[PDB]
């Protein structure tokens, strides 16, 4: 439209982010250590790692007992490091079966057992544990060679 001069100024804005924390009591509980022993594989080679599986279920069974076995589950797997044309996920597909089979049968042989619960809770461990072996091996390889 038309244009005319004007005068004004100033700018400000609100700030609404309060926080009021409180302290809480503390407690501590015990835990136990456990592990597994392999009987044999007959055609697969064992890789290098330390036990560190990390899985979250957001379910009842994770707190009920899985938290105790979380520390007993290994990270090393049995796989084909030989000259085989495999994609990263392809050798993992083969790896999950052989790793969970040797773990479930050896507990049964040791006088322990496994149920549907054990299959389900361990499957999620083993899925990532197989790819974790490759990703850590390949990282070591590009740094200082495989170990």
Curated annotation (Swiss-Prot):
Effect ascribed to mutating residue 133 to R = In GSD; with neurofibrillary tangles
What are the record's GO terms for cellular component? cell surface; cytoplasm; cytosol; dendrite; endoplasmic reticulum; external side of plasma membrane; extracellular exosome; extrinsic component of membrane
Q: Does the keyword Membrane apply?
A: yes
Which family does the entry's similarity section mention? Answer: Belongs to the prion family.
Query: What result follows from mutating residue 18 to L?
Result: In GSD and early-onset dementia
Give positions of region: Interaction with GRB2, ERI3 and SYN1.
6-146
Function, as annotated, reads:
Its primary physiological function is unclear. May play a role in neuronal development and synaptic plasticity. May be required for neuronal myelin sheath maintenance. May promote myelin homeostasis through acting as an agonist for ADGRG6 receptor. May play a role in iron uptake and iron homeostasis. Soluble oligomers are toxic to cultured neuroblastoma cells and induce apoptosis (in vitro). Association with GPC1 (via its heparan sulfate chains) targets PRNP to lipid rafts. Also provides Cu(2+) or Zn(2+) for the ascorbate-mediated GPC1 deaminase degradation of its heparan sulfate side chains.
Subcellular localization(s) per the UniProt record: Cell membrane; Golgi apparatus
What is the protein name for this chain? Major prion protein
Q: How does it sit in the membrane?
A: Lipid-anchor; GPI-anchor
Q: Where are the transmembrane segments?
A: none
| Lipid attachment locations (GPI-anchor amidated serine) | 146
Q: Which domain of life is it from?
A: Eukaryota
Q: What is the effect of changing residue 87 to S?
A: In schizoaffective disorder
Residues with glycosylation annotation: 97, 113
Its BP terms in the Gene Ontology are: cellular response to amyloid-beta; cellular response to copper ion; cellular response to xenobiotic stimulus; dendritic spine maintenance; intracellular copper ion homeostasis; intracellular signal transduction; learning or memory; long-term memory
The record lists the effect of residue 135 to K as:
Confers relative protection against sporadic Creutzfeldt-Jakob disease (CJD) in the heterozygous state
What does the further note read? This protein is produced by a bicistronic gene which also produces the alternative prion protein/AltPrP (AC F7VJQ1) from an overlapping reading frame.
Q: How does it assemble?
A: Monomer and homodimer. Has a tendency to aggregate into amyloid fibrils containing a cross-beta spine, formed by a steric zipper of superposed beta-strands. Soluble oligomers may represent an intermediate stage on the path to fibril formation. Copper binding may promote oligomerization. Interacts with GRB2, APP, ERI3/PRNPIP and SYN1. Mislocalized cytosolically exposed PrP interacts with MGRN1; this interaction alters MGRN1 subcellular location and causes lysosomal enlargement. Interacts with KIAA1191. Interacts with ADGRG6.
Residues in coiled coil: none
